[PDB]
C-alpha cells in the first residue's frame, strides 16, 4: 500500500518564520485530486520573501513554502482524466490561470500561487487538483523538471509568448539567476544573440560556456555603452530587466527603437525610475511579466523536449538540507537551487 | 502668377526666442517639392519649448516654429505625383516616417520633425517634399484639418494602431488638452466608455458636453478609487497618461490586469515613477507614444471623414496674433489653439 | 421546494429525427452543478442539421437539441461559487473552452458543444457544471440574452477578438442571418461602415433600419463592383463570409490588400473555392471562425450592456411550438429564432 | 573611367519571347539614382512566367527579366545618401514597399516589381533609385546574396514577420525549391523542427543534410497521416504551402488547431480547394504571402549575417548561359539558380 504519514517543511509563523520538519497524515484525495510523490523541488526567490516578510498574503498555517516540483503520480481520484498512476508531472505556479487573460482585478491584481495563497510543495506527497499539474518533460530528470514552472516559464513567457523573439534579435539578459539563464537558453535556441551583464567575471565565464555571445562586467564598464558598441548603435531588441536595480532608466537607453523591455521581479514596494526621453522617442514596449499560464507551460515542456534544453542548476540539496538551500538563495546562485527527495 | 514675397514668424535665436514677423522670397520648388498656401496652423505645446529651451535640437536660423498645418497646393514640381494644384493637404509631423518601424537608433532616438530639425510651417506658403503631405479630410475646414498631424495622430496611434481598442472598453483620459480630447472622441467613436480626469469643474462640464461618460475632479477625490467604483474594480482597459497629468504610479494602480497605459509626453527631463507590484502582478503593457507615421495619418483622415468627427478647437487666432496664441498655449487650452490664415 | 418532473423536446434517433415532447425527472445536481430554470432558447441552424444528419456526432439518446439558453439559477451544488440562486445566466456554446488556444487535435478538430457531444438545453430546467454558464447581460430580457452564446459570440469573435476592427473600417456582411446582424451591430458600435449583401429588398430595407450604411442586392448587381465603387476601389477592411452567401473567391476580389476575411459556416461538406491571385497579391488573412471561448463571451456581455445593444429577433415561439420554430429556422430568419419559456 | 556600353539579356516580345544579348549605352544616373555593377542574379520562377505568358503586365520593351541581384556600387548621384561607391548591395523585389501596408487597391492588388512593371536586373549595370537597394550581407558572396530579395524574404516574411515562428514549433515545408529551402533554414535557426515533403528520395537525402528533421516522400506515403504520426496527432504549427498543387485541402487536414498555413506561389489563375471542416473547426489562419518589404529584407540580411546562414544554390551559370539557366528553371531545382557575372 501507500504509507500513512508524510514529512513536510512547515512553519507556524512568518516574518519571522520558524520553518522545520513536521510529520502529518497523508491527506485524502478528493474526486478530482491526484496524489504525487515528490521527487524534486526548485526554490524561487519569492519563497524567501514569503517566509521572511509574509508578502501581504493570507496564509493557512502550518504553511509549506515553494511552488515548483516534479514528481510521480501515486493515486488519482474517481474522476481524474488528466493522469494515471506512474505519470511524471510538474506543478503549475498559478493554478487558476490556464490560458489567455491574467486573473485578478484592477484593485487586487495578485493572483493566487502555490506556496502562498495555495499550499506549497515542500513535502513528500502533494495532493492537489488534476488541473494543477502538467505532464513533465520526457527528456529531463526530476530535478531539472522542477525548475520550469516558475523561472523557465517566466523567461519563456517574456520572450516568446509576449515577446515573439526572432532569430537575429539581440537580447540582453540582466544577471545570472534562474530567469536570466533560461532566457539565455531560450534566446539562443531561437537564434538570437545574447548579451549577459554581471558584476562577476567568474559568472560571465560560466555564461560564456552556456553559449552567451557577450558578457559585460557592469562594475568594470558602462554596459549601455557596450550594448551600443555590440549592436552598431542599434540597441537591444529585447531586455530581460530583472531586479530593476540595474534598472529601467538604463534599459531605456539600451533598448532599440520599437524594442521590448520585460520587467521581472517580485519586490513588493520597489520603485522603478526612467527618463521619459527614450520612452517617448524610441517608443518601446515596457511590459510587466510574472510567470505564465499552463498552456504556456505545456508549450515550454514540448520545446524543452524537442530542443534538448538542460536547466542550469547551481546545486542540488538533500531534503533534510532545506535550511542550507534557502541560505544559498540569498548568496546569488548561478541558475537554480533544487531540492532532491 | 504667384506672389514673390511671403511672411513668416521666425527667430534668429532660441533660449530665449525673439520671434518677430519677417518677409522673404517664396522659395523655389524642386522636382518633388510642392508649394502650399497655408490656410491654418495648429500650435503644439512643443512649439513653446522649442522656442524657449531649443530642446537640444540643431535648428537652422532664421527658424520658423510649428509643424501642423493645412492648405491648398499652389504649384508642384516637374515630377510630383501625390498632389495636383488646388488639392487640399496637411503636413506630416515626422516626415519620412511612412509606416512600420520607427526611425532612430539606440544611442540617438530622436527623429526629425517639422518645426524642429526641419523648417516650421508658421508662414504664408510652405515649400516641402510631396511625401511630407497627405490629402486633407473632405469633411473639415482648414482650421480643423490642421489639428490632426500631431494631436489627432498621437491619440489615433495610441488607442487604435498600437492599442486595438474595442467597443465596450473603459478608457481614462487625463486632462483636456489636444491629445486628451481626440482621445475621448476616438474612444467614443469606437464604442468605449471614456472617463475624463481634470482639476477644473468647467473643463469637466465641457468634456461632458463632448460626451465623456464620467468626469473626475482629481482635486476633489482620489481618482483611482473613482475608476474602481466606475468599473466595479476591474479598473480601466486603456489609460492615456499625458505626462503632466496624474502620474504613472497612479495609472498603474488604476489599470486593469493586462490593460494598457499609453505614455504621452512633453518636457525633455521629466522622470517617471511607479510601484513595481502592479506593473508585475497586473502585467499591463506600458508604451511610450511619440506621435505616429504617415499611413496611420491617412487612416485617421479617412476615419475622421466617415465618422464626421469635429476636432475640438479652443480659439482661432489671426496670423498677426501668433504671440497671443502662444500665450493661450500655456494657459491650458481646452483642445486646440489654431492660427487661421 | 422544487418540481420533481420537467419536460423537454427529445428524440430517440437522428437522420431523420423523431423529436417529441417527453417528461423525465429533474436531474440531480453534483457538487459543482447548478440547476437553471430555462427562460429562453435560441435556435441555431446547426440544431436542424444535428437532428437531420447527426453531423458525425456521438449523441447520447434520448437527445435534446439546442445549445443557447438563458435562465434563472434555482439551486447550486455544495461547492459551486460562480453563481448563487436567483442569478441570471447564459449557456456557453463550447464548454471548457475558457480562453486562448482552442481545444482539439490535427486529426480530430471537432470540439464538444452543447446540443451535440453534450446534452441540449431545450428543456424546462438545465443541470450542468457551473463553468458552462456566464452571467447574463443586465440590459436584456432572457429571449435577448439567449441569442449571444453562438451568434453573438461568432461575430464578436471574428470582428473584435481576432479581427481588431477599428472605427473607420468598411465591413461587408453577407446575408441577414443571426451572425450577419450581430456583425452589423458590433461593426456600427465600433464606428465602422457596414455594407450588407442580400437577395431580398425587404431584408435590405430592414437592414437599413438597423443602420446598415449600404445594402446590395446580389441579384441586381455584381456586389464586388458595388464594394469597389463604395470604397473608392480600396475594397473592404473586413468581410464576414457566411458559408452559404456569395463565395470565397468573390470576397477575395472584394477584400482590401492586407484586409481580413472571416469564414463562418454551416454544412459539414461544403467545399470552398477561390482564385490564387488576389489571395497572394493582396495577402488578406483568411480565418475560419468556430464561435469563440468563454472569456470572449464575458467580454461580449459587458459590451452589450455598456453599448445598449439589442439583439435582432425574428420571432419568439412558445415552448410548445418548437416544431413551428424549427420550420422558421429554415425559411431564412432575419436574425434570431427564440423559444420563450 | 567607366565604360560606355553595357550588355543585357533582352526581349522585344513576350509570350512568346525572344530573349537575347543586346548592347546599349550605360544609362545616366539621376540625382538620386545609384549605378551598380552587377555581380550575381538569382532567377525566380516568375521570370519564366513573365517571359512566357506576359503575366498580364504592361512591359516596357526592350524588356530585361529578373529582379534579384547583388552588385557593387560604381557611382552615386549628387543627392545619394544611402550608399557610396564600393558598397555592396542587393536589390529589392517590391520597390514601392518600404514597410507596413502592402501597396495596391482592392480592385488592383498587383504591386509593381523589378523584372515586370519596373526594369529587370539581367544586365552588366543597373541604374535605379538609391531606395531600391539595401546593403548586402557582410558574410555572403555575390551569388548567395542575390538569392535573398525574393525567396529568402518570402520564407522570412511568412515565417517570422507574419508567422512569429517559435522554438519548438513543427513546420512543414512543401517541396525543395528556393522558398522551401530558405524556410527550412530559417525554421531550424529559430529552433523549430522541420518536415519536408518531396516526390524525390534524392532531394529528401539532400534536405536531410541541410538539417531537416524528417522527410516525407508523398508518392510513397500519405504525408498528412505521417505529419500526424510525427506530431503525436497535434498537427503542424506552420505549413509553407507552395504551389498549392499538393494543396490547401490536405494542408487544412495537417495543420494544428490555431496553426498557420502560408500560401506561396505566383500562378495567375490557379484554383485553391479545401474542405470547410478543418477550416472552421481548427480555425487556422490561412495567409497569402508574396515577398515582403525592405525593412523586412534588412532584418533578414542582419539575421543571415548573425546566423552564418548559407543559401542553397543548385547551380551557378556564366552570364552567356542564361538560356540554360532558364531551362534549369523548369526542371525543378534544389534551391536557387544563380547567374554569375
TrEMBL record, chains A, B, C, D:
Boundaries of every Enoyl reductase (ER) domain copy: 14-339
Keyword tags: Oxidoreductase
InterPro entries assigned: ADH-like_C, ADH-like_N, ER, GroES-like_sf, NAD(P)-bd_dom_sf, Zinc_ADH-like
A molecular function (GO) term: alcohol dehydrogenase (NAD+) activity
SUPFAM superfamilies: GroES-like (SSF50129), NAD(P)-binding Rossmann-fold domains (SSF51735)
E.C. number: 1.1.1.1
CDD domains registered for this protein in UniProt: MDR7
Oxidoreductase among keywords: yes
Protein name as it appears in the record: Alcohol dehydrogenase
Organism: Rhizobium meliloti (strain 1021) (Ensifer meliloti)
